[PDB]
Scaffold this active site. Structure first.
Site, mmCIF file in Angstrom:
data_model
loop_
_atom_site.group_PDB
_atom_site.id
_atom_site.type_symbol
_atom_site.label_atom_id
_atom_site.label_comp_id
_atom_site.label_asym_id
_atom_site.label_seq_id
_atom_site.Cartn_x
_atom_site.Cartn_y
_atom_site.Cartn_z
ATOM 1 N N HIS A 1 36.653 36.444 38.196
ATOM 2 C CA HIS A 1 36.826 36.113 39.614
ATOM 3 C C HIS A 1 37.474 34.746 39.805
ATOM 4 O O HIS A 1 37.790 34.372 40.941
ATOM 5 C CB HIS A 1 35.481 36.205 40.359
ATOM 6 C CG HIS A 1 34.492 35.147 39.992
ATOM 7 N ND1 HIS A 1 33.397 35.392 39.197
ATOM 8 C CD2 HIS A 1 34.418 33.838 40.339
ATOM 9 C CE1 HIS A 1 32.701 34.280 39.057
ATOM 10 N NE2 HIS A 1 33.292 33.323 39.750
ATOM 11 N N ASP B 1 32.969 40.914 34.513
ATOM 12 C CA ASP B 1 33.499 39.671 35.071
ATOM 13 C C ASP B 1 33.843 38.722 33.925
ATOM 14 O O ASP B 1 33.133 37.759 33.627
ATOM 15 C CB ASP B 1 32.489 39.050 36.031
ATOM 16 C CG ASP B 1 33.055 37.837 36.775
ATOM 17 O OD1 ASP B 1 34.292 37.666 36.807
ATOM 18 O OD2 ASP B 1 32.263 37.034 37.328
ATOM 19 N N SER C 1 31.111 28.678 37.789
ATOM 20 C CA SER C 1 31.555 29.964 37.264
ATOM 21 C C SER C 1 32.466 29.759 36.074
ATOM 22 O O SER C 1 33.296 28.851 36.065
ATOM 23 C CB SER C 1 32.338 30.744 38.334
ATOM 24 O OG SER C 1 31.482 31.513 39.165
#
Ligand SMILES: *[C@@H]1O[C@H](CO)[C@@H](O[C@@H]2O[C@H](CO)[C@@H](O)[C@H](O)[C@H]2NC(C)=O)[C@H](O)[C@H]1NC(C)=O
Ligand SMILES: *[C@@H]1O[C@H](CO)[C@@H](O)[C@H](O)[C@H]1NC(C)=O
Lengths: 218, 103, 223
Positions: C44, C88, C181
């Site tokens: 992402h 992801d 992230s």
């Protein structure tokens, strides 16, 4: 205003441009030498103290010594509801009084409770977007409109330019609807997008707040 | 070919938020409508989290909240097609927080 | 990183700071070097142009330990699911090989289908926000515990223990957060997880991509 026409210079000397950081964000109406009237959503999320009230303007791209400029002293609202877009009216007191002249004059308002009917012929005006990436209007625009009732709620006065895609657009909120020479509306919201040709434009019903306005400006 | 303002935003869908730190470009020193900004938000929802117009319609709730530089806030219901007819400055938006719940 | 401590500079020399730019916006993420020419991160975090900074502690200063490299390729897992944030994982092929030294060197990956027992202590590091009001210029880190999958399965309806790890004790204010992230979950000096997602509030538990579930793809992509 989309699909309208360039107003005649100073045709509507009660028309006001509200500007912030050199940008017209809404219209307004001179209702008293020291009070202008606009839409409540036009000031609900801004620092009023930087907002400048400009009277006697016609071409915002050009320099005009005809213009008068005032700051905002205080505001007066009656129950603006942002979720349902009800009571979308505000009165702004100025840091002075306008000098009434050939370019600037106080508008005229209708009587409390007066309701216009389907088919009534009115005029909208403003400096909002001109439509289809033409950008914001430099010279004030005016547009013939007809009051409608379909797809409208009684809390508003709704208008439609029947037969063609035209109407009010962004930058026109707070501008007046006039009608019989009487300011019956203040532009409040559109549906779908400007000049849909299928959804009416929604105006704040000035004739429903006449009592409070006089309670402010007397 | 022109300067841009970088507005932080967050997206939560069904109680999940990715932990990147992201920013939306707006043309600096510009004026925008709620139609313009709402369209940008819908585009972000789709490109970042695959949220479609159909999903927004069927969702229990779909909103975004603008936090302005003055400190006020405006909650916009993405399921509504009514737009106030005003313009506002790109420079006045501090943050945007998008929240979609299918429930 | 919420509730952590400033890292010892260069104590975590696999850490990468990612600046991602696309016409519509930008993002900041973490990542970690896994080979002299590849960085692992979250899918992402993908965007049109990615700048990778290795060897950094204060990313607001142009330290001389820093090595700046653009991602020549940014390879999102082919079944990455943006709706649920599944699969992801993303590999960045760097445009040049790093110069390996004390301050820049890769971190080991786990063995095939290697598992992590609940209670295992791990470290997560990054440059993300530390609260709702403040961020950080310098690398920070926090120790977190692997959880039983049920702790996440009720909160995150798309959580899949075969591909994800549940991390963090719900009672603590200790978590990865916005900007973290792509950074690694380090357990016993191996990178078992990738910071992926959690609650908008930042309250634990949070979800990490399970690196050991993607080793074949990782190996194939890097060859
Ligand atoms: C559009 O609106 C303007 C203003 O209301 C109309 O011009 C007026 O027309 C009436 C007759 O319909 C005249 O009595 C007024 O003297 C006019 N006023 C001005 C300021 O010109 C115009 O006719 C309207 N056009 C249409 C097609 O309805
Ligand atoms: C009111 O504000 C305007 C615009 O800032 C300024 O030109 C004018 O001098 C002010 N007048 C008073 C009396 O404050």
């Amino acid at each position: 205003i989309v699909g309208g026409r360039r107003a005649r210079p100073h045709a509507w000397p009660f028309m006001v441009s509200l500007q912030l950081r050199g940008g017209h964000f809404c219209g307004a109406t001179l209702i008293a030498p020291n009070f202008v009237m606009s839409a409540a959503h036009c000031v609900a999320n801004v620092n009023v103290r930087a907002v400048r009230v400009v009277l006697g303007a016609h071409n915002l791209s050009r320099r005009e010594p005809t213009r008068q400029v005032f700051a905002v002293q205080r505001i007066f609202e009656n129950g603006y509801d942002p979720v349902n877009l009800l009571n979308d009216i505000v009165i702004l007191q100025l840091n002075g009084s306008a000098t009434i002249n050939a370019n600037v004059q106080v508008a005229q308002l209708p009587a409390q409770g007066r309701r216009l009917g389907n088919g009534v012929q009115c005029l909208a005006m403003g400096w909002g977007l001109l439509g289809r990436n033409r950008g914001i209007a430099s010279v004030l625009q005016e547009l013939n409109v007809t009051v409608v009732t379909s797809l409208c709620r009684r809390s508003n006065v709704c208008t439609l330019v029947r037969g063609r895609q035209a109407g009010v657009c962004f930058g026109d909120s707070g501008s007046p609807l006039v009608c019989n020479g009487l300011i019956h509306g203040i532009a409040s919201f559109v549906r779908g997008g400007c000049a849909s040709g299928l959804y009416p434009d929604a105006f704040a019903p000035v004739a429903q707040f006449v009592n409070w306005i006089d309670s402010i400006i007397q | 070919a022109k300067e841009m303002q970088n507005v932080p935003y967050t997206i939560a869908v069904d109680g999940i938020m990715a932990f990147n730190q992201s920013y939306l470009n707006l043309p600096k020193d510009s004026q925008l409508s709620y139609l313009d900004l709402g369209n940008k938000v819908k585009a972000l929802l789709y490109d970042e989290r695959g949220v479609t117009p159909e999903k927004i319609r069927n969702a229990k709730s779909a909103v975004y909240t603008i936090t302005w530089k003055d400190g006020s806030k405006k909650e916009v219901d993405l399921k509504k097609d009514s737009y106030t007819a005003n313009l506002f400055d790109s420079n006045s938006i501090k943050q945007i927080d998008i929240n979609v719940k299918t429930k | 990183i919420i509730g952590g401590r400033e890292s010892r500079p260069h104590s975590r020399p696999y850490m990468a700071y990612l600046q991602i730019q696309s016409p519509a916006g930008q993002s900041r993420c973490g990542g970690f070097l896994v080979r002299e020419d590849f960085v692992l991160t979250a899918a992402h975090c993908w965007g049109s142009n990615i700048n990778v900074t290795l060897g950094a502690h204060n990313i607001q200063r142009r330290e001389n330990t820093q090595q700046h490299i653009t991602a020549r390729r940014a390879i999102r897992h082919p079944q990455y699911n943006q709706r649920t944030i599944q699969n992801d994982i993303m590999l960045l092929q760097l445009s040049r090989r790093v110069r390996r030294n004390r301050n820049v060197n890769p971190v080991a990956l786990p063995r095939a289908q290697e598992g992590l027992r609940p209670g295992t202590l791990c470290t997560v590091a990054g440059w993300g926000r530390v609260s709702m009001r403040r961020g950080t210029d310098t690398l920070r880190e926090v120790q977190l515990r692997v959880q039983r999958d049920r702790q996440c399965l009720r909160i995150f309806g798309s959580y899949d223990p075969r591909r994800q790890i549940c991390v963090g004790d719900r009672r603590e204010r200790k978590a990865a957060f916005k900007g973290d992230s792509g950074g690694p979950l380090l357990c016993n000096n191996v990178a078992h997880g990738i910071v992926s997602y959690g609650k908008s509030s930042g309250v634990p538990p949070e979800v990490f991509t399970r690196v050991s579930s993607f080793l074949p793809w990782i190996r194939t992509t890097m060859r």
